Amino acid sequence: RDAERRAYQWCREYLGGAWRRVQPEELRVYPVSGGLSNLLFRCSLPDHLPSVGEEPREVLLRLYGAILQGVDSLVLESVMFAILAERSLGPQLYGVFPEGRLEQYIPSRPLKTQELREPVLSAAIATKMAQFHGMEMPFTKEPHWLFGTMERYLKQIQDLPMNLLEMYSLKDEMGNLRKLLESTPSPVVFCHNDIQEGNILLLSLMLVDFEYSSYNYRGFDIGNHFCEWVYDYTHEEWPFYKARPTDYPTQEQQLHFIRHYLAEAKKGETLSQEEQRKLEEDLLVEVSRYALASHFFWGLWSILQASMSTIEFGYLDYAQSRFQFYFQQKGQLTS
Amino acid sequence: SRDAERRAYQWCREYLGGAWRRVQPEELRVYPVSGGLSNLLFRCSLPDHLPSVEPREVLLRLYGAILQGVDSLVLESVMFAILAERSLGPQLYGVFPEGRLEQYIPSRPLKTQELREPVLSAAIATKMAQFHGMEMPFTKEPHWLFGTMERYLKQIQDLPPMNLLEMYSLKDEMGNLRKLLESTPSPVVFCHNDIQEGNILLLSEPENADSLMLVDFEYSSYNYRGFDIGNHFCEWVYDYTHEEWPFYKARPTDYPTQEQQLHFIRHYLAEAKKGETLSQEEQRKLEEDLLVEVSRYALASHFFWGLWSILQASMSTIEFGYLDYAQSRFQFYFQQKGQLTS
CATH class of the missing domain: 3.30.200.20 (Phosphorylase Kinase; domain 1)
Structure with missing residues (x-):
């Protein structure tokens, strides 16, 4: 009341x-x-x-x-909402x-998890994401967000009142991930960082809820979206999500997305079919590595949320899922 | 450094x-x-x-x-962003x-004496009226004026260690001021609240007839129209470019005359009431009523900035005579209150 x-x-x-x-x-x-x-x-x-009146x-x-609710988040999320409103890119x-x-x-519905895999919607999402990646926003241009935020989360978790940090050796694994990504070039662009179905409104599309946005690696925004093909948060029983790991996009599905992403990203440029296929190949590899960072980021986030959130959701269960999937995909890269 | x-x-x-x-x-x-x-x-x-x-x-x-307070930070950040998007600011x-x-923005701020020039005063009035017509995503209730002064008074009362609060009986005088303004109607509009010469930029290469840009909406809020006007008029008195301590000069006789006030008011109302067909007698009534409204809300400018300046004596790191300035403001508050009783 x-x-x-x-x-x-x-x-x-x-x-x-x-x-x-x-x-x-x-x-x-x-x-x-x-x-x-x-x-x-x-x-x-x-x-x-x-x-x-009106x-x-x-x-x-x-x-x-x-x-x-941190002051840095408050400034960013408040200004980003206002800017997108002024540009008719948001409510x-x-x-x-x-x-x-x-x-x-805004009369709309969010997309459903299974709809992310439809080739027309998937192309539209890739085009929209490329549009945002082309934008200049008044936030730091240095890609501090990814590891800066994870290190913060890790420290906050350790300082809080099953031990996933010990079970999955997360402190050490963060160093391993850092190293892998240091060897994987990925252009720094304005990222949404949370391009899941619930943030994509069918009006034809509006991307909403830039609370997690920042300049970040292009590969994170793409990889993260691909990870979201696996997770359905409308599941009615505890833990209130369902994972389907086999729903991760196939190489064909990833290529379809990547082609429409680069069509928008490289609009106007004239590139040989050789150059085009190289861009595609390189981005496939880039994405497979940065996808691992989606798992690790949201795993850490979800552990912290188990203590900070008041929303009814299986945060620890979801964290377990992400870290398990992190290791799975890392295992698949090695082969 | x-x-x-x-x-x-x-x-x-x-x-x-x-x-x-x-x-x-x-x-x-x-x-x-x-x-x-x-x-x-x-x-x-x-x-x-x-x-x-x-x-x-x-x-x-x-x-x-x-x-630096979170409420201020959200407002000042979002306001700058909006005005940027609308080509109303940098x-x-x-x-x-x-x-x-x-x-x-290639420009210079206006000087104190330039505020009295009829052409610039008319352009300031127009621009102020334009902002007063806008809708902004902040609370529409006029809590700002007394809410902020109450907050400042309480914070001043808890500052570590003459006492201006005692000397000028500021706790009781705020109640007197509230009572006076409660009885003085003034439309609630989106106000800047700090329309001084330093915040009015004369554009050096304007692209159109708008040769002024109003900047620094950090103190902005829905507020009484009389405050924004009154406060501006108070700024005709104070020049912050004085090069020795206390780094301002007050000239009370520079407060705008009735004819200077009315000139401002006519251009303000021309913009505010744009389109609306008003008879000679209707215009004169609006003008006359606004002079009285402004005379009262001018007292709020002195009292607000006086309180702000006592607080700043503790909070600020900027070299300026904040206490000397507070005294000036409270003295002028009483002077003007003394002139109203007549």
Whole structure:
């Protein structure tokens, strides 16, 4: 009832016209699926209550989880939302505050896990991602994000009140991953870092929820998306996700994506079929290595979330899954 | 300082491209510039002999402690970003909790005496009215004015160790001020709250007839229109370019006359009420009522910036006579209150 009241007060404070009239009992505040970091509520005026002008009838209230409440995250996620709103690349911004946001509600659905593998959607996702990778954003251009964030998470985990750090020798393995990636060139671009089905709205596509975004290796954004082909978070029973490791894209599926990615990335350039096939081959290898970083990143994240999050989800189980999959794919690279 | 130079170098290198990633710290020119009384400002440029591969120069603005609170940080960051996207402010090249990297706009700030020039005063009024018409993603309730003053008063009361709070009976006077303004209606609009000559840039190569740019929305919020106008009028009195301590000069007789106020007000209303058909008697009533509104909300400018300046005496690292300035503001508050009773 106090998340209910807080929602009312935020709407009344930031929104105009009829929202200043609506009574606590009138206001419809429904929890909606917001993912595994933040809370999301759909707030809507009574059906009967007339508008004064062009105020929205419905908005989304998004509240940051603890893992996204750091001052650096707050600045980035607040400015990125505002910028994309101004550029019509995201939902309009009605209220912005340290705790969260009031956003435009866009009639849409998110994609489903199995839809990521359809060749037309997959091409569209690769094109959209290349578009974002071409953008200049006012954040550090140095790729500190990946290992900087993992080292932070590792330290926070160790300082918290089954021991996955010991079982999987994560401190040592992070050094091994660092070394592997040092030997794998990957261009630094503005990355979303979380391009899963729930962040891709079918309107035709809008990519949303840039909370994890930063300049990072191109291979991470691609590899990470590919990892997401495996994980379905709509599963109704604990741990509330289902993994299907065989759903990871085949070499054919990866190539299809990579071809449409590079079509947008290298738009206008004229490249021989030799050059083109080399770009494709090189990016396939780049991606197979940076995919490992997706597993490791989100594994560490999920361990920390088991203690920081209030969302009902099998965080430790999910972490186990990611680290198991990390080692599997590392085993497959060696062969 | 040598640490300030190195930090500036590192911000530029980390956020900017091309030659910024090649220039060595010995070669980057970092210049301290007039930043005002809240934030530090540095103009950073590539040496003339280092060709580009990107801006040749940028400004690095670092928030003072009074602007480092999370609420302030979200507002000031997002506001700069929005205004950039709308071509209402400089472009944003870097944004972080400590400050920003901004496009350098060829310009100069206005001077105190230039605020009284009829053509510039009219352009300031128009631009202020334009901002007052905008919708921004911040709370629409006018909590800012007394909410911030209340916060400042409480923080001042907990500062370690003459006592201006006692001398001028500021705790009781805030209540008197609240009571006066409660009875003085003023439309709640998106306000800048710091429209002083230092924040009004005369563009050196304007592309159109808008030859001014209003910058530095760090204190911005929904607020009473009378405050934004009144505060601007108060700024006609204070010149912060004075080169010896306390680094400002006050000229109370420079406060705008009724005719100077009305000139501003006419151009403000012309923009604010653009399109609306108003009779001679309707216009004159709007103008007359606004003079009274502004006379009262001007008192809030003195009281706000007086409180701010006591706090800054402790919080700021900028060399300025913050206590001497606080005294000036509170003296003028009472002077003007004394003039209203008449």
